[PDB]
Amino acid sequence: HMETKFVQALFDFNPQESGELAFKRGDVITLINKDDPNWWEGQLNNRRGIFPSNYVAPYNSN
């Protein structure tokens, strides 16, 4: 009973390692899931990755 949720980042993230998504400030990130209340997976309009959701804020959400 869930769907995709667009969020807006509030800090640049340059993950050199694999697994973490690459996002910028105020960058729209399509939430892929929320396995952990701390780390949320998202797709930067293409590239997927995991990162602390605390570095963003729901935009398209309610």
Side-chain angles (χ1 to χ4, degrees):
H1 63 188
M2 274 172 187
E3 271 140 318
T4 170
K5 273 160 159 80
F6 299 87
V7 284
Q8 218 217 46
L10 42 123
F11 228 103
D12 299 37
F13 200 74
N14 265 327
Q16 193 164 9
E17 310 145 63
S18 78
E20 281 200 288
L21 129 80
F23 55 110
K24 314 193 266 216
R25 242 153 110 280
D27 191 335
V28 186
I29 304 171
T30 319
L31 190 61
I32 307 157
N33 74 89
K34 277 172 299 208
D35 190 79
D36 8 279
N38 271 120
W39 282 58
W40 290 0
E41 199 127 34
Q43 199 218 241
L44 205 311
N45 216 26
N46 255 18
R47 45 259 261 163
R48 276 104 170 196
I50 48 150
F51 63 116
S53 32
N54 242 0
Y55 256 135
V56 317
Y59 175 80
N60 199 107
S61 83
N62 188 293

Short mmCIF file of all heavy atoms in Angstrom, two decimals:
data_model
loop_
_atom_site.label_atom_id
_atom_site.label_comp_id
_atom_site.label_asym_id
_atom_site.label_seq_id
_atom_site.Cartn_x
_atom_site.Cartn_y
_atom_site.Cartn_z
N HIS A 1 0.84 -1.23 0.00
CA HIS A 1 0.00 0.00 0.00
C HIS A 1 0.86 1.26 0.00
O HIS A 1 0.54 2.24 0.67
CB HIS A 1 -0.90 -0.02 1.24
CG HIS A 1 -0.14 0.00 2.53
ND1 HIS A 1 -0.75 -0.17 3.76
CD2 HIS A 1 1.17 0.18 2.78
CE1 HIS A 1 0.17 -0.09 4.71
NE2 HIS A 1 1.34 0.12 4.14
N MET A 2 1.96 1.22 -0.75
CA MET A 2 2.87 2.36 -0.84
C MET A 2 3.21 2.67 -2.29
O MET A 2 2.90 1.89 -3.19
CB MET A 2 4.14 2.08 -0.04
CG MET A 2 4.03 2.43 1.43
SD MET A 2 5.46 1.87 2.38
CE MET A 2 4.92 2.24 4.05
N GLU A 3 3.86 3.81 -2.51
CA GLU A 3 4.25 4.22 -3.85
C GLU A 3 5.53 5.05 -3.82
O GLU A 3 6.12 5.25 -2.76
CB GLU A 3 3.12 5.02 -4.51
CG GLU A 3 2.13 4.16 -5.27
CD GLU A 3 0.70 4.61 -5.08
OE1 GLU A 3 0.33 4.94 -3.93
OE2 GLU A 3 -0.06 4.64 -6.08
N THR A 4 5.94 5.54 -4.98
CA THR A 4 7.15 6.35 -5.08
C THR A 4 6.95 7.71 -4.42
O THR A 4 5.86 8.28 -4.46
CB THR A 4 7.54 6.54 -6.55
OG1 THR A 4 8.56 7.51 -6.68
CG2 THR A 4 6.38 6.98 -7.42
N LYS A 5 8.01 8.22 -3.80
CA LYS A 5 7.95 9.51 -3.12
C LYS A 5 9.16 10.36 -3.47
O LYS A 5 10.30 9.96 -3.25
CB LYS A 5 7.87 9.31 -1.61
CG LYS A 5 6.45 9.15 -1.09
CD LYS A 5 6.43 8.48 0.28
CE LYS A 5 5.13 8.77 1.02
NZ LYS A 5 4.03 7.89 0.55
N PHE A 6 8.91 11.54 -4.03
CA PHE A 6 9.98 12.45 -4.41
C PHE A 6 10.41 13.32 -3.23
O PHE A 6 9.57 13.91 -2.55
CB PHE A 6 9.53 13.34 -5.57
CG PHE A 6 9.18 12.58 -6.82
CD1 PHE A 6 7.90 12.08 -6.99
CD2 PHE A 6 10.12 12.36 -7.80
CE1 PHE A 6 7.56 11.37 -8.13
CE2 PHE A 6 9.80 11.65 -8.95
CZ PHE A 6 8.52 11.16 -9.11
N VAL A 7 11.72 13.39 -3.00
CA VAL A 7 12.25 14.18 -1.90
C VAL A 7 13.31 15.17 -2.40
O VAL A 7 13.91 14.97 -3.45
CB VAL A 7 12.88 13.29 -0.81
CG1 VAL A 7 11.79 12.64 0.03
CG2 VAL A 7 13.78 12.24 -1.44
N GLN A 8 13.53 16.22 -1.62
CA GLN A 8 14.52 17.24 -1.98
C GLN A 8 15.66 17.25 -0.97
O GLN A 8 15.45 17.43 0.22
CB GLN A 8 13.86 18.62 -2.05
CG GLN A 8 14.39 19.49 -3.18
CD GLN A 8 14.49 20.95 -2.79
OE1 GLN A 8 14.98 21.29 -1.71
NE2 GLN A 8 14.02 21.83 -3.67
N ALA A 9 16.88 17.06 -1.47
CA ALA A 9 18.06 17.04 -0.62
C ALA A 9 18.38 18.43 -0.08
O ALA A 9 17.98 19.44 -0.65
CB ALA A 9 19.25 16.50 -1.40
N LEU A 10 19.12 18.46 1.03
CA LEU A 10 19.51 19.73 1.65
C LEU A 10 21.02 19.79 1.85
O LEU A 10 21.52 20.59 2.64
CB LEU A 10 18.80 19.91 2.99
CG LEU A 10 18.73 18.65 3.86
CD1 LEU A 10 19.36 18.91 5.22
CD2 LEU A 10 17.29 18.19 4.01
N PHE A 11 21.75 18.93 1.14
CA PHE A 11 23.20 18.88 1.24
C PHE A 11 23.79 17.99 0.15
O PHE A 11 23.24 16.94 -0.17
CB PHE A 11 23.62 18.38 2.62
CG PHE A 11 24.68 19.22 3.27
CD1 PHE A 11 24.35 20.10 4.29
CD2 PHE A 11 26.00 19.14 2.86
CE1 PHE A 11 25.32 20.88 4.89
CE2 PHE A 11 26.97 19.92 3.46
CZ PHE A 11 26.63 20.79 4.48
N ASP A 12 24.91 18.42 -0.43
CA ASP A 12 25.57 17.66 -1.48
C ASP A 12 26.18 16.38 -0.92
O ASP A 12 26.71 16.36 0.19
CB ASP A 12 26.65 18.51 -2.15
CG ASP A 12 26.08 19.75 -2.81
OD1 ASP A 12 25.13 20.34 -2.26
OD2 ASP A 12 26.59 20.13 -3.89
N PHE A 13 26.11 15.30 -1.70
CA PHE A 13 26.66 14.02 -1.28
C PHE A 13 27.44 13.37 -2.42
O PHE A 13 26.87 12.94 -3.42
CB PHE A 13 25.54 13.09 -0.83
CG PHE A 13 26.01 11.96 0.05
CD1 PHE A 13 26.38 12.19 1.36
CD2 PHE A 13 26.09 10.67 -0.45
CE1 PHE A 13 26.82 11.15 2.16
CE2 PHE A 13 26.53 9.63 0.35
CZ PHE A 13 26.89 9.87 1.66
N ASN A 14 28.76 13.30 -2.25
CA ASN A 14 29.63 12.70 -3.26
C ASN A 14 30.21 11.38 -2.75
O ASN A 14 31.34 11.33 -2.27
CB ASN A 14 30.76 13.66 -3.62
CG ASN A 14 30.44 14.48 -4.85
OD1 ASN A 14 29.76 14.02 -5.77
ND2 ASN A 14 30.94 15.72 -4.88
N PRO A 15 29.43 10.28 -2.86
CA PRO A 15 29.87 8.96 -2.41
C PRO A 15 30.84 8.31 -3.39
O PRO A 15 30.47 7.97 -4.51
CB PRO A 15 28.57 8.17 -2.35
CG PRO A 15 27.69 8.80 -3.37
CD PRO A 15 28.07 10.25 -3.43
N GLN A 16 32.08 8.14 -2.95
CA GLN A 16 33.11 7.52 -3.79
C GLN A 16 32.93 6.01 -3.85
O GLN A 16 33.32 5.37 -4.83
CB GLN A 16 34.50 7.86 -3.25
CG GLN A 16 35.62 7.54 -4.22
CD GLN A 16 36.93 8.22 -3.85
OE1 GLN A 16 37.05 8.81 -2.78
NE2 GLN A 16 37.91 8.15 -4.74
N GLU A 17 32.33 5.44 -2.81
CA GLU A 17 32.09 4.01 -2.75
C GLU A 17 30.79 3.64 -3.46
O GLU A 17 29.99 4.51 -3.79
CB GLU A 17 32.04 3.54 -1.29
CG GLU A 17 33.21 4.02 -0.45
CD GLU A 17 32.82 4.31 0.98
OE1 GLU A 17 32.42 3.37 1.69
OE2 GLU A 17 32.92 5.48 1.40
N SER A 18 30.59 2.35 -3.68
CA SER A 18 29.39 1.87 -4.35
C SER A 18 28.28 1.57 -3.34
O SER A 18 28.55 1.19 -2.20
CB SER A 18 29.70 0.61 -5.16
OG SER A 18 29.80 -0.53 -4.32
N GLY A 19 27.04 1.76 -3.77
CA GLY A 19 25.91 1.51 -2.89
C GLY A 19 25.19 2.78 -2.50
O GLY A 19 23.97 2.79 -2.35
N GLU A 20 25.95 3.86 -2.34
CA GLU A 20 25.37 5.15 -1.96
C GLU A 20 25.02 5.96 -3.20
O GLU A 20 25.78 6.00 -4.17
CB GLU A 20 26.35 5.93 -1.09
CG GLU A 20 26.36 5.47 0.36
CD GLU A 20 26.93 6.51 1.30
OE1 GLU A 20 28.16 6.73 1.27
OE2 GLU A 20 26.15 7.11 2.07
N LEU A 21 23.85 6.60 -3.18
CA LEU A 21 23.40 7.40 -4.30
C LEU A 21 24.08 8.77 -4.31
O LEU A 21 24.41 9.32 -3.26
CB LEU A 21 21.87 7.54 -4.27
CG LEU A 21 21.30 8.96 -4.40
CD1 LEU A 21 21.31 9.41 -5.86
CD2 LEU A 21 19.90 9.03 -3.82
N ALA A 22 24.27 9.33 -5.50
CA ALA A 22 24.90 10.64 -5.64
C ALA A 22 23.84 11.72 -5.84
O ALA A 22 23.16 11.75 -6.87
CB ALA A 22 25.88 10.63 -6.80
N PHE A 23 23.71 12.60 -4.86
CA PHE A 23 22.72 13.68 -4.93
C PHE A 23 23.33 15.01 -4.52
O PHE A 23 24.36 15.06 -3.85
CB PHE A 23 21.53 13.35 -4.03
CG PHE A 23 21.91 13.06 -2.61
CD1 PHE A 23 21.60 13.95 -1.60
CD2 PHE A 23 22.58 11.89 -2.28
CE1 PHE A 23 21.95 13.69 -0.29
CE2 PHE A 23 22.93 11.62 -0.97
CZ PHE A 23 22.61 12.51 0.02
N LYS A 24 22.67 16.10 -4.92
CA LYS A 24 23.14 17.44 -4.59
C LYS A 24 22.13 18.15 -3.70
O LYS A 24 21.20 17.54 -3.19
CB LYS A 24 23.37 18.25 -5.87
CG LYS A 24 24.15 17.49 -6.94
CD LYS A 24 24.62 18.42 -8.05
CE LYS A 24 23.63 18.46 -9.20
NZ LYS A 24 24.32 18.58 -10.52
N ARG A 25 22.32 19.46 -3.52
CA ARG A 25 21.42 20.25 -2.69
C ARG A 25 20.14 20.58 -3.44
O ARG A 25 20.18 20.99 -4.60
CB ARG A 25 22.11 21.53 -2.23
CG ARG A 25 22.27 21.64 -0.73
CD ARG A 25 23.46 22.49 -0.34
NE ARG A 25 23.06 23.77 0.24
CZ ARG A 25 22.67 24.82 -0.48
NH1 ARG A 25 22.63 24.75 -1.81
NH2 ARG A 25 22.32 25.95 0.13
N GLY A 26 19.01 20.39 -2.77
CA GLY A 26 17.73 20.67 -3.39
C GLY A 26 17.48 19.80 -4.61
O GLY A 26 16.65 20.12 -5.45
N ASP A 27 18.22 18.70 -4.70
CA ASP A 27 18.10 17.78 -5.82
C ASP A 27 16.96 16.79 -5.58
O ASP A 27 16.89 16.14 -4.54
CB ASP A 27 19.41 17.03 -6.02
CG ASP A 27 19.44 16.25 -7.32
OD1 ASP A 27 18.36 15.89 -7.82
OD2 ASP A 27 20.55 16.00 -7.83
N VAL A 28 16.07 16.68 -6.56
CA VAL A 28 14.94 15.77 -6.47
C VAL A 28 15.39 14.32 -6.54
O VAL A 28 16.00 13.91 -7.53
CB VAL A 28 13.91 16.03 -7.59
CG1 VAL A 28 12.66 15.19 -7.38
CG2 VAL A 28 13.56 17.51 -7.66
N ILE A 29 15.11 13.56 -5.49
CA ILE A 29 15.50 12.15 -5.45
C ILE A 29 14.29 11.24 -5.29
O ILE A 29 13.62 11.26 -4.26
CB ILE A 29 16.49 11.88 -4.30
CG1 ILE A 29 17.71 12.79 -4.45
CG2 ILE A 29 16.92 10.42 -4.29
CD1 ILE A 29 18.64 12.76 -3.25
N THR A 30 14.02 10.45 -6.32
CA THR A 30 12.89 9.52 -6.30
C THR A 30 13.15 8.39 -5.32
O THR A 30 13.99 7.52 -5.56
CB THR A 30 12.63 8.96 -7.70
OG1 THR A 30 12.78 9.96 -8.68
CG2 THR A 30 11.26 8.35 -7.86
N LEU A 31 12.43 8.40 -4.20
CA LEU A 31 12.60 7.38 -3.17
C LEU A 31 12.37 5.98 -3.74
O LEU A 31 11.32 5.70 -4.31
CB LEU A 31 11.63 7.62 -2.01
CG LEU A 31 11.88 6.75 -0.78
CD1 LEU A 31 13.26 7.02 -0.21
CD2 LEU A 31 10.81 7.00 0.27
N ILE A 32 13.36 5.11 -3.56
CA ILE A 32 13.26 3.74 -4.04
C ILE A 32 12.64 2.85 -2.97
O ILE A 32 11.93 1.89 -3.28
CB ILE A 32 14.65 3.19 -4.44
CG1 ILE A 32 15.34 4.12 -5.42
CG2 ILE A 32 14.51 1.79 -5.03
CD1 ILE A 32 16.84 3.98 -5.45
N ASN A 33 12.91 3.19 -1.71
CA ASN A 33 12.37 2.44 -0.58
C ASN A 33 12.73 3.12 0.74
O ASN A 33 13.26 4.23 0.75
CB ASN A 33 12.87 0.99 -0.59
CG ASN A 33 14.31 0.87 -0.17
OD1 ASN A 33 14.62 0.73 1.01
ND2 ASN A 33 15.21 0.93 -1.14
N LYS A 34 12.45 2.45 1.84
CA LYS A 34 12.74 2.98 3.17
C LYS A 34 13.00 1.86 4.16
O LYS A 34 12.39 1.81 5.23
CB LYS A 34 11.59 3.86 3.65
CG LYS A 34 11.64 5.28 3.13
CD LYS A 34 10.38 6.06 3.48
CE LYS A 34 9.14 5.41 2.88
NZ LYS A 34 8.06 6.40 2.62
N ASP A 35 13.89 0.94 3.80
CA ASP A 35 14.22 -0.19 4.66
C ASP A 35 14.59 0.28 6.07
O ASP A 35 14.22 -0.34 7.06
CB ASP A 35 15.36 -1.00 4.06
CG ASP A 35 15.59 -2.31 4.79
OD1 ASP A 35 14.82 -3.27 4.54
OD2 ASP A 35 16.53 -2.38 5.61
N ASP A 36 15.34 1.38 6.14
CA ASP A 36 15.77 1.93 7.41
C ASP A 36 15.28 3.37 7.58
O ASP A 36 15.48 4.20 6.69
CB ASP A 36 17.29 1.90 7.53
CG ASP A 36 17.98 1.50 6.24
OD1 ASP A 36 18.06 0.28 5.97
OD2 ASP A 36 18.44 2.40 5.52
N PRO A 37 14.66 3.69 8.72
CA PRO A 37 14.17 5.05 8.99
C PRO A 37 15.29 6.08 8.91
O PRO A 37 15.03 7.28 8.79
CB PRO A 37 13.62 4.96 10.43
CG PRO A 37 14.21 3.72 11.00
CD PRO A 37 14.40 2.78 9.85
N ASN A 38 16.54 5.61 8.97
CA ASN A 38 17.69 6.50 8.90
C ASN A 38 18.22 6.62 7.48
O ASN A 38 18.51 7.72 7.01
CB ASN A 38 18.81 6.01 9.82
CG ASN A 38 18.69 6.58 11.21
OD1 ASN A 38 18.56 5.84 12.19
ND2 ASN A 38 18.73 7.90 11.30
N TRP A 39 18.37 5.49 6.80
CA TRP A 39 18.89 5.51 5.44
C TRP A 39 17.81 5.15 4.43
O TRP A 39 17.20 4.08 4.51
CB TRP A 39 20.09 4.56 5.32
CG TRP A 39 21.35 5.15 5.87
CD1 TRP A 39 21.55 5.60 7.14
CD2 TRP A 39 22.59 5.34 5.17
NE1 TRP A 39 22.83 6.07 7.28
CE2 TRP A 39 23.49 5.92 6.09
CE3 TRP A 39 23.02 5.09 3.87
CZ2 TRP A 39 24.80 6.24 5.73
CZ3 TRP A 39 24.31 5.41 3.52
CH2 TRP A 39 25.19 5.98 4.45
N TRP A 40 17.57 6.05 3.49
CA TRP A 40 16.56 5.83 2.46
C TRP A 40 17.20 5.71 1.09
O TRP A 40 18.14 6.42 0.76
CB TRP A 40 15.55 6.98 2.46
CG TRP A 40 14.66 7.01 3.67
CD1 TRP A 40 14.67 6.15 4.72
CD2 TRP A 40 13.62 7.96 3.94
NE1 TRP A 40 13.71 6.50 5.63
CE2 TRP A 40 13.05 7.61 5.18
CE3 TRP A 40 13.12 9.07 3.25
CZ2 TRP A 40 12.01 8.34 5.74
CZ3 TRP A 40 12.08 9.79 3.82
CH2 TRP A 40 11.54 9.42 5.05
N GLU A 41 16.66 4.80 0.28
CA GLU A 41 17.17 4.59 -1.07
C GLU A 41 16.44 5.50 -2.04
O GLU A 41 15.24 5.71 -1.92
CB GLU A 41 17.00 3.13 -1.48
CG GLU A 41 17.89 2.71 -2.64
CD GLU A 41 18.71 1.48 -2.33
OE1 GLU A 41 18.21 0.60 -1.59
OE2 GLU A 41 19.86 1.38 -2.83
N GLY A 42 17.17 6.06 -3.01
CA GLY A 42 16.55 6.95 -3.97
C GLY A 42 17.23 6.94 -5.32
O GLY A 42 18.38 6.51 -5.44
N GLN A 43 16.52 7.43 -6.33
CA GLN A 43 17.05 7.48 -7.69
C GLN A 43 17.13 8.92 -8.18
O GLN A 43 16.10 9.57 -8.39
CB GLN A 43 16.18 6.66 -8.63
CG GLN A 43 16.89 6.28 -9.92
CD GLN A 43 15.96 6.33 -11.12
OE1 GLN A 43 15.73 5.33 -11.80
NE2 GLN A 43 15.43 7.52 -11.40
N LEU A 44 18.35 9.42 -8.38
CA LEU A 44 18.55 10.78 -8.85
C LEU A 44 18.18 10.89 -10.33
O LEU A 44 19.03 11.18 -11.17
CB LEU A 44 20.01 11.21 -8.64
CG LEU A 44 20.23 12.72 -8.51
CD1 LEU A 44 19.53 13.47 -9.64
CD2 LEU A 44 19.75 13.21 -7.16
N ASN A 45 16.91 10.66 -10.63
CA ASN A 45 16.42 10.73 -12.00
C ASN A 45 17.07 9.67 -12.88
O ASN A 45 16.99 9.74 -14.11
CB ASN A 45 16.68 12.12 -12.59
CG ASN A 45 15.57 12.58 -13.52
OD1 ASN A 45 14.42 12.15 -13.39
ND2 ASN A 45 15.91 13.45 -14.46
N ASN A 46 17.71 8.68 -12.26
CA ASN A 46 18.36 7.60 -13.00
C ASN A 46 19.20 6.73 -12.08
O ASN A 46 18.89 5.56 -11.86
CB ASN A 46 19.24 8.18 -14.11
CG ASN A 46 18.62 8.02 -15.49
OD1 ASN A 46 17.42 7.79 -15.61
ND2 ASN A 46 19.44 8.14 -16.53
N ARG A 47 20.27 7.30 -11.55
CA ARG A 47 21.17 6.59 -10.66
C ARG A 47 20.53 6.33 -9.30
O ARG A 47 19.98 7.24 -8.68
CB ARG A 47 22.47 7.37 -10.47
CG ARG A 47 22.25 8.86 -10.21
CD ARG A 47 22.49 9.68 -11.47
NE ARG A 47 23.81 10.29 -11.48
CZ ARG A 47 24.39 10.79 -12.57
NH1 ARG A 47 23.77 10.74 -13.74
NH2 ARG A 47 25.60 11.32 -12.49
N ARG A 48 20.60 5.08 -8.85
CA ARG A 48 20.04 4.69 -7.56
C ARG A 48 21.12 4.67 -6.49
O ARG A 48 22.31 4.71 -6.80
CB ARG A 48 19.40 3.30 -7.67
CG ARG A 48 17.97 3.33 -8.21
CD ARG A 48 17.92 2.88 -9.66
NE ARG A 48 16.54 2.67 -10.12
CZ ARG A 48 16.22 1.99 -11.22
NH1 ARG A 48 17.17 1.45 -11.97
NH2 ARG A 48 14.95 1.85 -11.56
N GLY A 49 20.70 4.62 -5.22
CA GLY A 49 21.67 4.60 -4.14
C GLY A 49 21.03 4.80 -2.78
O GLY A 49 19.91 5.30 -2.67
N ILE A 50 21.75 4.42 -1.73
CA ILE A 50 21.26 4.56 -0.36
C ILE A 50 21.99 5.69 0.36
O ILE A 50 23.16 5.94 0.10
CB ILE A 50 21.43 3.26 0.45
CG1 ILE A 50 22.84 2.71 0.27
CG2 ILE A 50 20.38 2.24 0.03
CD1 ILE A 50 23.33 1.93 1.47
N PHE A 51 21.29 6.36 1.27
CA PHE A 51 21.88 7.46 2.02
C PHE A 51 20.95 7.90 3.15
O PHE A 51 19.77 7.58 3.16
CB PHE A 51 22.15 8.64 1.09
CG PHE A 51 20.91 9.21 0.47
CD1 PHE A 51 20.52 10.51 0.75
CD2 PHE A 51 20.14 8.45 -0.39
CE1 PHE A 51 19.37 11.04 0.17
CE2 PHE A 51 19.00 8.97 -0.96
CZ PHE A 51 18.61 10.26 -0.68
N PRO A 52 21.49 8.66 4.12
CA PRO A 52 20.70 9.17 5.24
C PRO A 52 19.60 10.11 4.77
O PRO A 52 19.89 11.16 4.19
CB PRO A 52 21.72 9.92 6.11
CG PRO A 52 23.06 9.45 5.64
CD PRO A 52 22.89 9.11 4.19
N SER A 53 18.35 9.74 5.01
CA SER A 53 17.23 10.56 4.59
C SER A 53 17.24 11.91 5.29
O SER A 53 16.59 12.86 4.85
CB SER A 53 15.91 9.84 4.85
OG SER A 53 16.00 9.01 6.00
N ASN A 54 18.00 12.01 6.38
CA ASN A 54 18.11 13.25 7.12
C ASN A 54 18.75 14.35 6.27
O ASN A 54 18.70 15.53 6.62
CB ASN A 54 18.92 13.04 8.40
CG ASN A 54 18.12 13.31 9.65
OD1 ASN A 54 16.94 13.66 9.59
ND2 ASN A 54 18.77 13.15 10.80
N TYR A 55 19.36 13.95 5.15
CA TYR A 55 20.00 14.90 4.26
C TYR A 55 19.04 15.41 3.19
O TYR A 55 19.46 15.98 2.18
CB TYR A 55 21.21 14.25 3.58
CG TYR A 55 22.54 14.68 4.16
CD1 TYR A 55 23.53 13.75 4.44
CD2 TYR A 55 22.80 16.02 4.43
CE1 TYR A 55 24.75 14.14 4.97
CE2 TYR A 55 24.01 16.42 4.96
CZ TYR A 55 24.98 15.48 5.23
OH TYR A 55 26.19 15.87 5.76
N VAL A 56 17.74 15.20 3.40
CA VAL A 56 16.74 15.63 2.43
C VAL A 56 15.43 16.02 3.10
O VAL A 56 15.34 16.10 4.33
CB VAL A 56 16.47 14.54 1.37
CG1 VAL A 56 17.78 13.91 0.91
CG2 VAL A 56 15.55 13.47 1.93
N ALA A 57 14.41 16.25 2.29
CA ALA A 57 13.09 16.63 2.78
C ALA A 57 12.03 16.40 1.70
O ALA A 57 12.12 16.96 0.61
CB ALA A 57 13.09 18.08 3.24
N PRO A 58 11.00 15.58 1.99
CA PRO A 58 9.93 15.29 1.04
C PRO A 58 9.42 16.54 0.33
O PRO A 58 9.07 17.53 0.97
CB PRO A 58 8.84 14.68 1.92
CG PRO A 58 9.59 14.01 3.01
CD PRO A 58 10.80 14.87 3.27
N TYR A 59 9.38 16.49 -1.00
CA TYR A 59 8.92 17.61 -1.81
C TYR A 59 7.53 17.33 -2.38
O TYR A 59 6.57 18.04 -2.08
CB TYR A 59 9.92 17.89 -2.93
CG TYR A 59 9.46 18.96 -3.90
CD1 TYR A 59 9.60 20.31 -3.59
CD2 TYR A 59 8.90 18.62 -5.13
CE1 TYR A 59 9.18 21.29 -4.47
CE2 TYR A 59 8.49 19.60 -6.02
CZ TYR A 59 8.63 20.93 -5.68
OH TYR A 59 8.22 21.90 -6.57
N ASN A 60 7.44 16.30 -3.22
CA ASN A 60 6.18 15.93 -3.84
C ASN A 60 5.24 15.27 -2.83
O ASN A 60 4.03 15.22 -3.04
CB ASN A 60 6.42 14.99 -5.02
CG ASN A 60 5.24 14.93 -5.97
OD1 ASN A 60 5.29 15.48 -7.07
ND2 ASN A 60 4.17 14.27 -5.55
N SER A 61 5.81 14.75 -1.75
CA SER A 61 5.03 14.09 -0.71
C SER A 61 3.92 15.00 -0.20
O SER A 61 3.80 16.15 -0.63
CB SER A 61 5.93 13.66 0.45
OG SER A 61 6.16 14.73 1.34
N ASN A 62 3.11 14.48 0.73
CA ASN A 62 2.02 15.25 1.30
C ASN A 62 2.52 16.18 2.40
O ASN A 62 3.26 15.70 3.29
CB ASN A 62 0.95 14.31 1.86
CG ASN A 62 -0.30 15.05 2.29
OD1 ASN A 62 -0.28 15.83 3.25
ND2 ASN A 62 -1.41 14.82 1.59
#
